[PDB]
Write a protein that binds this ligand. Structure first.
Ligand code: K
Ligand code: K
Ligand code: ZN
Length: 427
């Protein structure tokens, strides 16, 4: 009926599942990776790679040094550590939790290479924000056409990694042509640093959760969800940063976390620019991204779809599955599960959009289709470069469960890392 905001923090905390110990997560049934790499049981794989994985969080995800150690990737299980311990070189990148995909891609570039974020003169002028952002040391500084990586992005992270791959490969005409000093190499094109792009629970065609909500309310709701993890009091402690430096929205000297959050929530940013996550998450905004962010011909693309709704036999609406769906997502799942729209200049939303994972419509997750020329095929026991390999649906699994909040997923990720290591070179 009603999506809660911070006004309803008490009821959210009340309805929420308790955070579990690592021991208790390990007692849950492990998620099973569904396939073997093609031909592994018919012949020798001879063309594999040693490229590392870089993990990229979604909307309202935070870094390894935030949330008092609770990890985006695995929660109380440190998936990065487990992957490295089992021989799968893995890093974690951290970008703006509520910034646009463009801004996040520029941040991701700097996070990997090292240096100061550069959003582009042209872009920064157009959207009226700073050209330069924060400074990072670099987690994989030697990245190159020879030293490629596998990008894995959850939620909005999947849009962000598509966007980085587009910019690396083809650059930005607007940036190239504006005649700025010391253009970021990101915008020049010609870089083939990415071997694969994997999206997990990604709004590749947006999510109608953004369409149906006022932006401020969506953000406020998501602070509520964060609170179910941090605890309602620790939610207002200095254990996370919204990273809106470019907008002049850093926490002020002497400002409390609570005052900082209220100030950001009350900002004009949420209804006054398209250069923000809430726009980029909407179906209109995702469609716009899709009109220029294409699947590159020399990169493997994989998509994973989560679902935790069932169809109501009475109305045809999709509703939360009791058990699999976090109770915090009951209202979001149920509103998306009955949201239609047939309005000029906007994507037509019909019953195919109803099934969801609490946050993102299932139909949106297999790859970009709105405004896209990308090819999508369901995985058929062979991998195809330059197009989307839409992998077997991850049913009975909500939006956060697939990153360990809450689920036993470490073996799935280790098996996926093994799978990715078999991928052979572009011809
Ligand atoms: K909206
Ligand atoms: K769940
Ligand atoms: Zn921007």
């Amino acid at each position: 009926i009603k999506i809660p905001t911070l006004e309803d923090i008490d009821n959210l905390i009340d309805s929420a599942e308790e955070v579990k110990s690592e021991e208790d997560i390990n007692k849950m049934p492990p998620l099973k990776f569904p396939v073997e790499f093609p031909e592994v049981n018919t012949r020798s794989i001879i063309g594999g790679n040693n490229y590392p994985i870089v993990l990229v969080h979604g909307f309202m995800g935070f870094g390894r040094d935030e949330l008092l150690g609770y990890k985006y990737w695995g929660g109380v299980v440190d998936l990065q550590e487990k992957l490295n311990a089992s021989g799968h070189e893995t890093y974690t990148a951290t970008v703006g939790p509520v910034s646009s995909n463009w801004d996040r891609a520029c941040e991701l570039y700097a996070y990997i290479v090292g240096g100061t974020v550069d959003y582009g003169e042209a872009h920064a002028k157009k959207f009226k924000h700073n050209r330069y952002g924060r400074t990072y040391p670099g987690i994989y500084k030697n990245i190159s056409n020879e030293n490629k990586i596998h990008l894995i992005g959850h939620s909005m992270g999947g849009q962000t990694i598509r966007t980085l791959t587009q910019l690396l490969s083809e650059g930005s005409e607007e940036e190239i042509n504006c005649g700025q000093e010391n253009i970021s190499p990101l915008f020049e094109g010609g870089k083939h640093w990415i071997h694969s792009v994997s999206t997990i629970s990604t709004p590749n065609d947006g999510t109608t959760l953004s369409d149906l909500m006022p932006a401020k309310d969506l953000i406020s709701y998501t602070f509520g969800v964060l609170g179910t993890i941090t605890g309602k009091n620790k939610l207002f402690s200095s254990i996370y940063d919204l990273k809106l430096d470019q907008w002049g929205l850093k926490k002020q000297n002497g400002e409390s976390q609570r005052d900082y959050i209220e100030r950001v929530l009350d900002s004009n940013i949420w209804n006054s620019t398209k250069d923000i996550a809430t726009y980029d998450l909407s179906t209109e905004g995702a469609q716009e991204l899709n009109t220029w962010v294409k699947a590159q011909p020399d990169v493997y693309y994989f998509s994973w779809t989560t679902q935790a709704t069932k169809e109501s036999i009475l109305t045809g609406h999709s509703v939360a599955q009791i058990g699999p769906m976090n109770p915090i997502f009951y209202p979001t799942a149920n509103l998306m599960g009955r949201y239609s729209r047939n309005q000029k200049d906007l994507p037509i939303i019909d019953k195919k959009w109803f099934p969801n994972d609490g946050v993102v419509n299932c139909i949106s997750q297999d790859g970009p289709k709105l405004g896209s020329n990308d090819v999508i095929e369901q995985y058929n026991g062979g991998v195809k470069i330059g197009q989307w390999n839409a992998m077997p649906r991850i049913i009975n699994t909500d939006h956060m469960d697939i990153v360990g909040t809450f689920g036993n997923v470490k073996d799935w990720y280790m098996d996926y890392a093994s799978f990715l290591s078999n991928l052979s070179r572009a011809l």
